[PDB]
Ligand binder design. Structure first.
Ligand code: BOB
Ligand code: BOB
Lengths: 219, 221
């Protein structure tokens, strides 16, 4: 077949987790960047977008929208979705906690300027008091190098992706969390991810002033 | 061994689609309702809520939190998740569209009133202009009884659950969507679903104000 093709803005938002997972699985993909309202509306009007939204990924002859469906397909295709129904329960429960947190980080650059610090202090507090404790607790309990099933899954992938973003927000958050740190290093050391973490990869930077109003100059 | 046990408020919210899906799967379940902040703190303190949130469903020895984790497990356990990876992808695409709308419906009672008008307009707009046309098209695309793979999946149950909510909201929205009506009727007349739709089932009423103040009082005493 073809390379998976990613339709999105040139930036992180809702496509980034997929860029990570495909690169983490060692899958070359191509990107067709949505640069204007007109790129979006051509996709909408050509019938590529079931709910009129992106992300969309053309992969194995399907036009897949919705981040979770995109990810679930990719996870399952490349065996990063565990080996049984109980591992997937654990994995889903984990990655849904991550996606809740991660959702707040995606929306942060869109709330009104005057609300930004409030939300950031809220996020930070949720990191320190809810999400990091929960994930440390998981690694602490079983002692293993991976979150689930003692081998690599999408949950380690999505978790570390998020540890990077949290490092960007404030780097003292992971400090009381030894095992989160350790996980970040080990997974960052995997050939596929190491590669994706180097300069020139399809990995995207934080949202900046350009990307933010670009995104508005559509909605 | 035992029946699944649902730990939620006494009402729809984030637990309702699990009630439909287990019902649709023909699975009897018990419900333990959270009435007070104390009930919530007992669950948290027992270490039973991984993110300190509910829904929580005790099922097959596990304590599952996160709606989608719960639903995927049930879905997969009772063969309501399609037969292969590509079917799963259509099911997920379809139900995440439903989830997006459902999220707006779930939050709508905890708006300030100044926001409630617009929010309610937005919900109708999207039902009319995005979601119903999207699923109608799918049904037209293949002419079959079911959304995916021509057998009952979780996608028909979540979508029909939605059609019941849109009817309560405004019964004229579905009028221009004959294929959506047809599905609603056929799914409602499957034994497990028929049973759940009858009066006196665990199916829950629309949120009212006793529900809204119950939830406020539990999280903000
Ligand atoms: C608040 C200002 C704009 C914010 C837009 C953000 O949602 C994101 C921008 C950052 O990348 S992404 C663009 C959006 N997509 C979705 O919301 C998909 C959600 C689905 N649940 C998913 O996970 O796939 C979009 O295409 N919107 C057209 C529209 O709604 O008509
Ligand atoms: C003050 C107003 C409260 C509104 C709460 C609403 O979100 C919902 C009400 C619908 O009945 S439900 C209670 C909420 N649960 C989740 O948000 C789970 C989300 C997860 N992504 C899921 O899908 O499972 C909750 O437990 N909140 C405590 C907290 O997070 O600390």
């Amino acid at each position: 077949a073809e390379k998976p093709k990613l339709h999105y803005f040139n930036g992180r938002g809702r496509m980034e987790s997929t860029r990570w997972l495909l690169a983490a699985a060692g899958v070359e993909f191509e990107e067709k960047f949505i640069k204007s309202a007109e790129d979006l509306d051509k996709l909408r009007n050509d019938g590529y977008l079931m709910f009129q939204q992106v992300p969309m990924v053309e992969i194995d002859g399907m036009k897949l929208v919705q981040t979770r469906a995109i990810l679930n397909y990719i996870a399952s295709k490349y065996n990063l979705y565990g080996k049984d129904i109980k591992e997937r329960a654990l994995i889903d429960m984990y990655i849904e906690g991550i996606a809740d947190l991660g959702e707040m980080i995606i929306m942060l650059p869109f709330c009104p300027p005057e609300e930004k610090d409030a939300k950031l202090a809220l996020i930070k507090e949720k990191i320190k008091n809810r999400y990091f404790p929960a994930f440390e607790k998981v690694l602490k309990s079983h002692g293993q190098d991976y979150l689930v099933g003692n081998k690599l899954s999408r949950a380690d992938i999505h978790l570390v992706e998020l540890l990077y973003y949290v490092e960007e927000l404030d780097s003292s958050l992971i400090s009381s969390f030894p095992l989160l740190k350790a996980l970040k290093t080990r997974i960052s050391n995997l050939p596929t991810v190491k590669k994706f973490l180097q300069p020139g990869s399809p990995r995207k930077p934080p949202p900046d002033e350009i990307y933010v109003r670009t995104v508005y100059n559509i909605f």
